[PDB]
Structure formats: structure tokens, C-alpha cells
Design a protein around this ligand. Structure first.
Ligand SMILES: *CCN[P@](=O)(NCCBr)OCc1cnc(N(O)O)n1C
Ligand SMILES: *CCN[P@](=O)(NCCBr)OCc1cnc(N(O)O)n1C
Ligand SMILES: [Cl-]
Lengths: 305, 305
């Protein structure tokens, strides 16, 4: 037993990370089959960032201006194109370590692992969630641009995030692997502020089920509630409204524990109204919301890849 | 920027994980060069666990009783021996994916990554610390026995932990890769209780420096303290006493931020005496102590492997 913030094993993706240089800018790219994916602002000078015209800047670039390096060996670029906010660099060699993979666009509230890289080399791995305001709370230093987020279903990596920028508030914004930003953000250095960081209610409930499975029980009470009454409390505390779809998705955790979903909502209600009174739940003094119901079942079941 | 609980990339170790079966017990082993390492209780029946005599139980086992499987392909066992609490199974094939590696025995307060596995297959990765009472707070289900903990220094994996058992309190105990348990624990199903889980003071201070570097500043005050006066407060709150060696190790973080170590101790003092008053630091409502000073510098610098 025990319950931890856990990332997927990173080996399958480590073998896909390369370094991309255009002019004086170096960041990371993702090498799958014979295509390397990277953020399009690799072509920008720091000046260009105030107001870049990416089509015009691309006119000045040729295949040989994109220096792609895989470990110690250089890849030959034989074509390049822009798809939304990413560049796709066609190389003459298929990545021999290409895993089975898919490109997915995730919904807010879903979780994924990030492999932070610098200069095409991995630095660490950690677990993130796509926030309701379409930011993520990551760890990205200079050179980390182009790191990707992913999930693994057995042997197939589903890529969902590529890192592009940090906003003045210290949170992070990026694209799916088709180059479309999550949320309203744009790859320009300008005034864009994140909206309300609401809490992912269904995830908090999954985590409370996880705590019960792992011996932390003190927060279970004698009460129940209804969706409409709980949601009045969720509104006040900037929690996502809970829907019947969320209730349904929590069914398996309800069954394993014998605690009805609405009973656990009543526990969450009291926790929001009274606080934790200095106590902890699974080693946290706040309510964690970056575990999905599927994450909990997975970790409490021992699924492998 | 941003600061996250980060594990090392797991690929180098994924390529070392195999499945070991003896009789009706299956767990994980670590395949380096032509030796597979695994917990010795793989030879035990559930009955034997009340009071096992490992030398006598080993008499009944031969090379061919240890079934070692690497992915879908079987390894041939050509020798076996017991070193303390691990078995070393000599196989006829050197692991072609063996990384540069070392076996290290870590000190309490040090941190490391765990690759949780079941049946020789990775499930996830997360970051741990060796607690002052020589337990770790992990996530280990049935079949997770034999998962290892490690650090990576550039290209060399330093293995420091192998998982053996869970104690009735839900915490975890294991060995170094020479088979010697951390702390006083023994591989028998019996009454062994963990001591006081004291907080790793030097790590909490590193993390406060990390917060300052990342914009969380509200806890800085106008006070300072001395080692002897701070330690009176540490004693009361079950914190490790702070030494001059710890102060020295925090020097680089002191220099980067311009905050003297003892000034930050005064901040920690007030946090212990007054609490966080409902506030948060780097997204936590308690004081985190599983980041080392080296972890912080690493993550705030972008070191790669
Ligand atoms: C990976 C982000 N690149 P960077 O230039 N430097 C690391 C910041 Br910790 O971040 C700023 C940036 C890059 N691109 C944009 N953009 O698309 O406007 N921004 C803001
Ligand atoms: C990896 C631990 N094996 P397990 O038998 N089953 C998973 C528990 Br979540 O744990 C109990 C165990 C195994 N070996 C010992 N021992 O050496 O006494 N114990 C307590
Ligand atoms: Cl917390």
C-alpha cells in the first residue's frame, strides 16, 4: 500500500528526445518515425517575441538552418513545414526507437507525465494535470521548451502536451502535438493572464477514495448530500461543479470501498467548510486534485506497461 | 520556473528489470551484467514468513528452480548465492542494456527515485527519501517486491534501495544492493515498529530556498537566530538537529538568494511556532522535507543526464 504522485516510466519517450537549434535558439524536439516536432518559436530572436509573424519569419529558413541532434549524432533535415504552432522537420532517418504512439488532445482535469529536457537530454519526470484554466503547474527552466507530456496505455504512448512558454505568474502553457494551444494562449511575449484556477472536484473525490483504501479514514462522517446541494458548496470554494458523468466515473471506487459517491461528497463538503483542523490526508494538508479516478484505480491495482 | 517533486528519468533502469519466480512466488529482480539481484524471501512460502531460516530453505533450491524472465525471453541461471538479504542469480547472458552503475548505501535524509514494478514490468516512477527512522514512504502493491531506488549522476546509475516489505503501519523497508537492511528491520513477518518519523530539517530549508527562487516569499521575516536556539525549537517539533555541516551544505543556496542560512532558520522557526495560517508554499500547506539541497540546485539549474 501507500499512495504517491506517480509518473509513467519515461524510457519510451527518452528515446524520442532530440535537440533542435535554429540560429541562436536551442530547445527540444520529439522524434517519431521520420519527423521531428518542436515549437515554432525556435525560429524567433528574443526581439521577434514582442510581435512575431511566423509565416514571414519562416521564409528566411531552409532545411539546413534547422540543426537536429540526437545524442551525439546529427540528423539530416529534408523538409520542414508549420502546423499551427509547431514545426515538423522531416529527417532522412526513422527513429529506430519510435514506440507505438498516438496524438491526443486531453480535456481539463486529465493528468499526464512530463519528461523535462534541456538540449535534447532528459532531466526529470513528474506528473501534471491540465488545469480548468488550461494552464499546467510544471517545472520548466530555460532550454526546457519542447518537453512533452504523455500517457502510456500498456505499450502505446499517447502524447498530449508540448511545452512552449511560461506566463508572468509562473504557470505554463503549451500545445497538443498538432500545435494547437490549450486554452486561449498564443506564442507571443505579451499580456495574457490565466483565469481562475478552479479545483478539479472529481479528482479530489478519487483521492479521498484512495485515502480510504490506504487507511486514512478520519474524514468520513455520518452525512450525505445531493449533487445540487454539494454544488452550492463547490461554487463558493471555486470547485468544478460535479455532474452525473463524474458520479458514474467514480462508480468503481464507490464499489471497491462501499462508500456511496454522495456520502464522500458530504465528507468533502465538511472538509471545505471546516478545513483539516491541522490533520493530514495521505501526507497532504490540502485537498489534492491531480489524481484522476483512473489514476487511483491504476495505482491501487498495479497496472504495468 | 516552477518547482515539482521530480524523479530521475527511468529508462536506464527499465532496461534492467526482470521477473523472478521461485515456486509460487513472483517478484522483481535487477539484471546488471550477468547477475540478477532479488530479495531472498522469493524462496519463502507464506507460512515460512513467521520464522524463516534462509540457509535451510536454500538447501532445497537449485539453479533451475529460479525462473528468470526478461520481457518475453527466459534467462538461463547458472549459479546462485545469498548475500545478506538478497539473492544473486548468475545468468549465462550479460544484460545488453546494462548502464554504467554503482551500488551505494545512502544516509537518512538523502533522496532517490523508485521505479515501481510488477512481474518485471514497470508501473510508475516517484521520488522518495530515506527517513530518519530508516523507512521510506512509497507505493508498493503485491508483486512490487524487488523494485529498486536509484540516483543518476550524468550517465551512471547509483542503486541504493531494493524493496522488501511493508510494515503494519503502511510504511516500507528494504535493503541496499548488498542485501543489508536500512535500519533495524528484518525479513520476517513479525512485530517490528518504526521509530519517530523526524523531519529532515536541512531539506525543509533547501525547499524554502527553492520557494524564494520561485516567487513564494511571504514567509521571510525580519528575524535571525542561532544554531543552538533554533535547535531548541527543532527538538520540540521532532525536527532533526541542524549542524554546521548542514549550514555549509546550504551555502550555495544562501549565495544565490542572498538570504543567510540562519535568517532562513528564523523563518522556519516562526513557521513551526505559528503555522502557515492557511497559506501555501510551492503549492503545499505543510513543510516539505524530501528535497535535498542538491535536488534544489539541480532542478533550479537544469542538470541533464
Ligand atoms: C520553453 C519556454 N521558452 P522561453 O523563451 N525561456 C524559458 C522561460 Br523559464 O519562455 C518564454 C517564451 C518562449 N516563447 C514564448 N512565447 O511563445 O510568447 N514565451 C513567452
Ligand atoms: C514486496 C513485499 N512483499 P509482501 O509479501 N506482499 C506485498 C505487501 Br503490500 O509484503 C509482506 C512481506 C514480504 N516479505 C516480508 N518479510 O521479509 O518479513 N514481509 C513482511
Ligand atoms: Cl500539503
Amino acid at each position: 500500500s501507500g499512495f504517491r504522485k506517480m509518473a509513467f516510466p519515461s524510457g519510451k519517450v527518452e528515446g524520442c528526445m532530440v535537440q533542435v537549434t535554429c540560429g541562436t535558439t536551442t530547445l527540444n524536439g520529439l522524434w517519431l518515425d521520420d519527423v521531428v516536432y518542436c515549437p515554432r518559436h525556435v525560429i524567433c530572436t528574443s526581439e521577434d517575441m514582442l510581435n512575431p509573424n511566423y509565416e514571414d519569419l519562416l521564409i528566411r529558413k531552409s532545411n539546413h538552418n534547422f540543426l537536429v541532434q540526437a545524442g551525439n549524432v546529427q540528423l539530416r533535415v529534408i523538409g520542414h513545414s508549420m502546423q499551427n504552432c509547431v514545426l515538423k522537420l522531416k529527417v532522412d532517418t526513422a527513429n529506430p526507437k519510435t514506440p507505438k504512439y498516438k496524438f491526443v488532445r486531453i480535456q481539463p482535469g486529465q493528468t499526464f507525465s512530463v519528461l523535462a529536457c534541456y538540449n535534447g537530454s532528459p532531466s526529470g519526470v513528474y506528473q501534471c494535470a491540465m488545469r480548468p484554466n488550461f494552464t499546467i503547474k510544471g517545472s520548466f527552466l530555460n532550454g526546457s521548451c519542447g518537453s512533452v507530456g504523455f500517457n502510456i496505455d500498456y505499450d502505446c504512448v499517447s502524447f498530449c502536451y508540448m511545452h512552449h512558454m511560461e506566463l508572468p505568474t509562473g504557470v505554463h502553457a503549451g500545445t497538443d502535438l498538432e500545435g494547437n494551444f490549450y486554452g486561449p494562449f498564443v506564442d507571443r511575449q505579451t499580456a495574457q493572464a490565466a483565469g481562475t484556477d478552479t479545483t478539479i472536484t472529481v479528482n479530489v473525490l478519487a483521492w479521498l477514495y484512495a485515502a480510504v483504501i490506504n487507511g486514512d479514514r478520519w474524514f468520513l462522517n455520518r452525512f450525505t448530500t445531493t449533487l445540487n446541494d454539494f454544488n452550492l458548496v463547490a461554487m463558493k470554494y471555486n470547485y468544478e461543479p460535479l455532474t452525473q458523468d463524474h458520479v458514474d466515473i467514480l462508480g468503481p471506487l464507490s464499489a471497491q470501498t462501499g462508500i456511496a459517491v454522495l456520502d464522500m461528497c458530504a465528507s468533502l463538503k465538511e472538509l471545505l467548510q471546516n478545513g483539516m483542523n491541522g490533520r493530514t490526508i495521505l501526507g497532504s494538508a490540502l485537498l489534492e486534485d491531480e489524481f484522476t479516478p483512473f489514476d487511483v484505480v491504476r495505482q491501487c491495482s498495479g497496472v504495468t506497461f
